[PDB]
Amino acid sequence: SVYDAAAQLTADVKKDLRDSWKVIGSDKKGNGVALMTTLFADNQETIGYFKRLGDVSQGMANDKLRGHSITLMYALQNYIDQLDNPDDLVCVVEKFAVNHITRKISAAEFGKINGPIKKVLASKNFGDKYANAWAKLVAVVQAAL
Amino acid sequence: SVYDAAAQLTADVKKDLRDSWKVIGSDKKGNGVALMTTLFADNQETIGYFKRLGDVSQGMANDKLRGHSITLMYALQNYIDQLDNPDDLVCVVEKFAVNHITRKISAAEFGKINGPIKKVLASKNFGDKYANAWAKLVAVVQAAL
Ligand code: HEM
């Protein structure tokens, strides 16, 4: 359950999330778009879910993709800001899950974002330690799908 | 159309938006909930769009309502952050409109948020000057609906 998964966010995990986000969240547009393009490159099968975005290969030049990418980063910002209060983190996660459940995005499908996050982190000198911390946060969302 | 509405966001307007947001955005949970509860109290009919939130009379104590309220504030955070670049502000606003268009929320309906905003601002001692600034930001969104 999402409640048990949120309890997996221990002291050090929350700390590593904040330290890495401090850098990653500094450039929401750049890292957000990098995140999306990496997802589409490593998992071409997910492109079907984003038909509305148009030609995703245009990257930054695609206004709809850029708008989506920037917005996506504010969802992560939201998560990070709610780390202090488990009750708030949970209600925010369930709220977020609504539209993804409606699009029929499964926990397994959502989990594909872990690869792109790991690669973006690595490009900023954040190793496995951080990728694993982010995988734990992603697991909270997966628990609600 | 959205670009034209964005043209109304002058240097002075953006300055008042940023200064007021520095305070309003410092307590997203408290002010986000205040915004929603004020909307429902002043325009009871808007509750018809939020059946999923359940018993909205519980206010802050309602996990779903609290989750929605906090999330709403990150959309405003997004907007404030993109003020200095019309191209990004526009793509984020159009991205935002997609789901509200699907919900059949007209520009007139959306405009009902102006009263609650004015009241929340006044609770923090921000006068008409600031209220007019926000009405202009809301107008950009209305142009997309
Ligand atoms: C770090 C993970 C992710 C975050 C934080 C995130 C964030 C968001 C946000 C904030 C929105 C806009 C609000 C909404 O419509 O719900 C959104 C839309 C969407 N998301 Fe997610 N998402 C993530 C991963 C995924 C994945 C892995 C998929 C699918 C494989 C997915 C599919 C969608 C789709 C199809 C849309 C609509 C895009 C559009 O038409 O504009 N998301 N997501």
Ligand code: HEM
């Ligand atoms: C400044 C004003 C507003 C902001 C920033 C805002 C922000 C948001 C955000 C970020 C979401 C979640 C993402 C999504 O599903 O689109 C949302 C959902 C929603 N909004 Fe808006 N919104 C505003 C005003 C309104 C108004 C005035 C109405 C209708 C009278 C409305 C109705 C809805 C509905 C029904 C949902 C889904 C709620 C749920 O079931 O969880 N919004 N809005």
